[PDB]
């Protein structure tokens, strides 16, 4: 769980490698709120944050 | 998509110095030279020295795989070090060669690629395949004793690895 | 044959913008390394640039913008977020470890070289790290944090009445433009894509203001421009520019995202065409300061600036790429040059001549005899 | 067990030359110098050069086992060649190093030990174990394409072989 | 410190006397190689001796003895057998491929060096190949085909009135003795085993003849002589010799079969003791010409002449043998020195003093003031 400096304080990003199946070796990216709530996509994260951040130019995968 | 005007946008334009005025800029605080282009040496001699710098390097790593050590010694870091050794010694071949064998002993230059341990290399291939290209977390969780910027230098060198085949 | 000074700090390839980010400083290290193995390194004066301190960065920027940069880290990233938004540091300009170190090297290279040009102890000076042209006085923009170009130019003005700034980068050089928008001593010429593209500025009608009116030249362009079309509109315009603006020092930003097959760019230029511009400029035998800039298919960025360095030394190099640490990066081919794509050039002759003429009028407004 | 007297035993004694007479002896027909003992060089520099001469040699045989090649390059033949290269080049380190890398390419010196093929070496160990130390017959019947004197030089070098254990 | 000239031809180690034969030229190559690795090579003037031609070998030998040698081969070995018997070439002096080449190198080394001494451009000159002292005018003997020593001496007589010849070899130096038996210009001193030993000559009463009477000194000895006994009888006698014979050039044959544990020899000398003689001679600061000679435990032959070369350079060397191509030859120890054996010294003080006195009388017969 890495701090994501471009999100507000306490937000973290984690990348997880798939271990088996059709997409073995590909990864999934997750974000965690300061309280530890887990988010799995850009629109889910944007819905949660609302107007407190502008995510138009935010690259969900890299966190930049 | 708009260009702005005002004190908070434009730069204050620096006035041309008088014929008597001097810019007052200390050049040693700004640069330090690493290779003069007008040398008493010829291409052949520099080329030759580079071969020698490579040979020492191979013989160095023979003193604690032949082709491997030679290739290792032929990498750029060794060459760059060879071009500095020349310049530091004022392009005196005879003096510069002493530099390479200080006290009868040769010198070793190893880039992060070659320098890392087998197990560090291993750690890296686990951290990448697990955290992708997130190099601060790759250090924090996998190689915390290494400095970020060494992990970067390693990354790029590793991308050319032979055993490395992400393409098909 | 002109004397060339090359500025490089080994650390510059190792600073990293962030996962998924297109700007990759490593491309300069790739160039550096080719230059050594193509034997060009040998032939020019190689300088390590000391770090530029806040002292000289504030010669243009805010005392509290640089202060912010000197201070900010990924540690205190959630503490500063207030100031982060005021200064544009985020979505496409990340914070990252070493950021301020990176700026110091890029700026040090450009400034040191400017001095070198003013001190009249070189003809050409090259700093591929530099060229970061989207930066503003009080905010970062388009991957640029410090505008090394402005600072460089500000030093040149100390010895040069008129400084010409040419910008090949596919993106409009709005940082260097805005900084000199109201002055007649510096003329900013820029050839770039326009229309649904960054930075949204630099159309035909962007001419300057005040004393700086008729001193900001722009050439807006659509997709798919050839070497042939580009050459046929660069030489005419620049010869007029020299004719009219009569400068005494040139600063050519050699942005490599105007090449074909760039990740962000959508132009169809080859290294050859791209370089023909550098060669044309060099021909006007003025103190010249080559900087880099954009470029996001780094294999080609490497190729380009390696080639364009040869051009400054007017030495030939083979298409055969020399072995190097990153040799394996260069495709199955391992060649220096790239060829153009089947991509369609939407810059019809009619559209280029309309614009050309409008610019020729603008340039005629300057004083002459 | 007897000492003899007479014209057919004693030597005719060579008369002392007059202060005006000269011995008439051409010194180039008698000797050719191979190392001057009073050199502008110091022990350190010669030592250093020897290391370099060794490194080239190892890097030479890397271009068509690491420790093996280094030891191979450290043998006396390479050293002797290194001391001649110095003297031929008038004890100019910078000039002598060119000699070692004539055109960017290194030089290889291999003694008969190293130079022989695997199968020649094999032939030798059959010929010895079969004809003992009768080196003319060892050639005639086993290695007739080699010159006797190369087989001798090989023999002695082979006697120190590791895999060679005649003692217990 | 004296200047030394060292003569060596790489080929000399490679000539071979024959299966089962004790004389092994390879021992010179072993020395050569140690000298290089002990760093001594470095410190002296190294010369390759050109081949001595029949021209200068016949300056002492038969025009038809050398002719025979130039001609003989192992091919025409059964054709010549007539002449083979007249010239002593067989049982212990084999024919062998390169034989005449071997002689030319041994003789070339000694002659070249003699010249070098006469030309006054060295103080000491060393040729380990040489020293082959059993040869006669018209026949080979005791492994010696050409008497390089005589030829060497004959050249020295051109500039030196009195030439002293000292012979340490365990075998009596009858070749050099017989060649100069009737002259007063050359004094031949020899210390050797006697009684059921080769060459059967050189007892107490062997004094010379004619003008050469009282100019051939000999010291006959039994088995097992120490360094201590040898030293105590060499220095006294040689100081008298110098005192009386007052020479102007010395030729020291440094036969190494007088060392302990030799294959053919039966003396109990160490390298140290053996060398003490070379050092004592050198001390008399005369133009000096060191040759080798016998020696048949080649590991020690190598050691000896390596050490004795150091002595001529008065430089120290460690007992630690340096690595070399033949390093593995030197036992489990890999040391330079040898120690004496438990072997019993049958040279009682009474027997040595009897002889000593007889020689002191002989030497007194020479002219002096
Ligand atoms: O290592 P990075 O700096 O993150 O860049 C890599 C790299 O691009 P470069 O080689 O031009 O640096 C990959 O190229 P290869 O390693 O495959 O040669 C590329 O893969 P593709 O060239 O196949 O696109 C990949 O892109 P992606 O992440 O889309 O697979 C991209 O990473 P970034 O996209 O994060 O820059
Ligand atoms: O190779 P060669 O010139 O014929 O000499 C060898 C050799 O003696 P050196 O090493 O002193 O030359 C042997 O020694 P190693 O190879 O065993 O070390 C020795 O064996 P010993 O030392 O065990 O006697 C052997 O003698 P022999 O043939 O009696 O076994 C002897 O050969 P020659 O006797 O023919 O000289
Ligand atoms: K542009
Ligand atoms: K302007
Ligand atoms: K004797
Ligand atoms: K006599
Ligand atoms: Zn751009
Ligand atoms: Zn003897």
Residue numbers in the entry:
A (entry chain C): 149 to 212
B (entry chain A), D (entry chain D): 165 to 228, 237 to 340
C (entry chain B), E (entry chain E): 8 to 376
What does the study report here?
The Nucleosome Remodelling and Deacetylase (NuRD) complex is a multi-protein chromatin modifying machine that plays an essential role in cell lineage commitment and DNA damage repair. The complex controls expression of genes through two distinct activities: removal of acetyl groups from chromatin through the action of a histone deacetylase enzyme and remodelling of nucleosomes through an ATP-dependent helicase. The deacetylase module from the NuRD complex contains three protein domains that control the recruitment of chromatin to the deacetylase enzyme, HDAC1/2. Using biochemical approaches and cryo-electron microscopy, we have determined how three chromatin-binding domains (MTA1-BAH, MBD2/3 and RBBP4/7) are assembled in relation to the core complex so as to facilitate interaction of the complex with the genome.
To visualise how MBD2 interacts with the HDAC1:MTA1 dimer we used cryo-electron microscopy to determine the structure of MBD2 bound to the MTA1(ELM2-SANT):HDAC1 complex. The dimeric nature of the complex was immediately apparent in the raw micrographs with front-on particles resembling ‘bowties’ (i.e. two HDACs flanking the MTA1 dimer interface). On fitting the HDAC1:MTA1 dimer structure into the map, it was apparent that the complex was asymmetric with additional density appearing on one but not both of the MTA1-SANT domains. Having placed the two crystal structures into the map, the remaining unaccounted-for density was extracted and examined. Particularly interesting was density from the intrinsically disordered domain (IDR) of MBD2, and the CC domain, which appears to wrap around both sides of the dimerisation interface. On inspection of the MBD2 sequence we identified a short hydrophobic motif (I/VTxQI/V) that is repeated twice in MBD2 with a linker of 36 amino-acids. Binding of the two motifs across the MTA1 dimer interface would explain why one bound MBD2 would occlude binding of a second MBD2. The 3D map was high enough resolution to model a single MBD domain (MBD2 residues 145–220) in close proximity to one of the MTA1-SANT domains.
